[PDB]
Amino acid sequence: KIRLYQFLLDLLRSGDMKDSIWWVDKDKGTFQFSSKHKEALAHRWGIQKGNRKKMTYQKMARALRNYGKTGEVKKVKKKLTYQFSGEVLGR
DNA sequence: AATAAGAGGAATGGGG
DNA sequence: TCCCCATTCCTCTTA
């Protein structure tokens, strides 16, 4: 099954939900969620995973925070903004 | 207050 | 057995 960070990277590469997520500085791997349209993206994540409950942005970001220690995705000190690692971006 | 982002401990669930 | 990779629930903090 696809990992959350790869789901997000794939959306950014495909442009499929441009009103929900976008690059801020693509060369640095920083990206930002839409305040108003992030829930539709969270719903898509849960449906893709076949999860029992409806996915929410809060639960998706709870998972995102678990990448902080291993490095794939880190929170940036800007609203709704995160950053992929160079390793993640190289693949 | 109302709204909302940010956080994480802890329990619970996936699929090896 | 016990780690993988989350998901779900709950409470607290910050803006």
From Swiss-Prot:
Q: In which tissues is it expressed?
A: In the bone marrow, concentrated in hematopoietic stem cell, lymphoid progenitor, myeloid lineage (granulocyte macrophage progenitors, classical dendritic cells, monocytes) and B-cell clusters. Among B-cells, predominantly expressed in pre-B1 cells. Expressed in germinal center B-cells.
Protein name per Swiss-Prot or TrEMBL: Transcription factor PU.1
Gene Ontology CC, one term? nucleus
What quaternary arrangement does the UniProt entry report?
Binds DNA as a monomer. Can form homomers. Directly interacts with CEBPD/NF-IL6-beta; this interaction does not affect DNA-binding properties of each partner. Interacts with NONO/p54(nrb). Interacts with RUNX1/AML1. Interacts with GFI1; the interaction represses SPI1 transcriptional activity, hence blocks SPI1-induced macrophage differentiation of myeloid progenitor cells. Interacts with CEBPE. Interacts with IRF4/Pip and IRF8. Interacts with JUN. Interacts with RB1. Interacts with TBP.
Q: What induces it?
A: Highly expressed in both FV-P and FV-A-induced erythro-leukemia cell lines that have undergone rearrangements of the SPI1 gene due to the insertion of SFFV. Negatively regulated by microRNA-155 (miR-155).
Asked if the keyword Transcription regulation belongs to this entry, the reply reads: yes
Q: Which family does it belong to?
A: Belongs to the ETS family.
Residue ranges of the annotated DNA-binding region, renumbered to this chain: 2-85
Positions bound to DNA:
49, 62, 65, 75
* Gene Ontology biological process terms from the UniProt entry: anatomical structure regression; apoptotic process involved in blood vessel morphogenesis; cell differentiation; cellular response to ethanol; defense response to tumor cell; endothelial to hematopoietic transition; erythrocyte differentiation; follicular B cell differentiation
Disease (UniProt): Agammaglobulinemia 10, autosomal dominant: A form of agammaglobulinemia, a primary immunodeficiency characterized by profoundly low or absent serum antibodies and low or absent circulating B-cells due to an early block of B-cell development. Affected individuals develop severe infections in the first years of life.
What is the annotated localization of this protein? Nucleus
Transmembrane residues, as ranges?
A: none
Q: Which UniProt keywords apply?
A: Activator, Developmental protein, Disease variant, DNA-binding, Nucleus, Phosphoprotein, Proto-oncogene, RNA-binding, Transcription, Transcription regulation
Q: What does this protein do?
A: Pioneer transcription factor, which controls hematopoietic cell fate by decompacting stem cell heterochromatin and allowing other transcription factors to enter otherwise inaccessible genomic sites. Once in open chromatin, can directly control gene expression by binding genetic regulatory elements and can also more broadly influence transcription by recruiting transcription factors, such as interferon regulatory factors (IRFs), to otherwise inaccessible genomic regions. Transcriptionally activates genes important for myeloid and lymphoid lineages, such as CSF1R.
Q: Quick one: where is this thing mainly located?
A: nucleus
Q: What is the effect of changing residue 73 to G?
A: In AGM10; very low protein expression, if any, in peripheral blood mononuclear cells; when tested in transfected cells, decreased transcription activation; in vitro, fails to bind PU motif-containing DNA probes; does not affect interaction with IRF4 and IRF8, nor nuclear localization
Which is an annotated GO molecular function term of this record? sequence-specific DNA binding
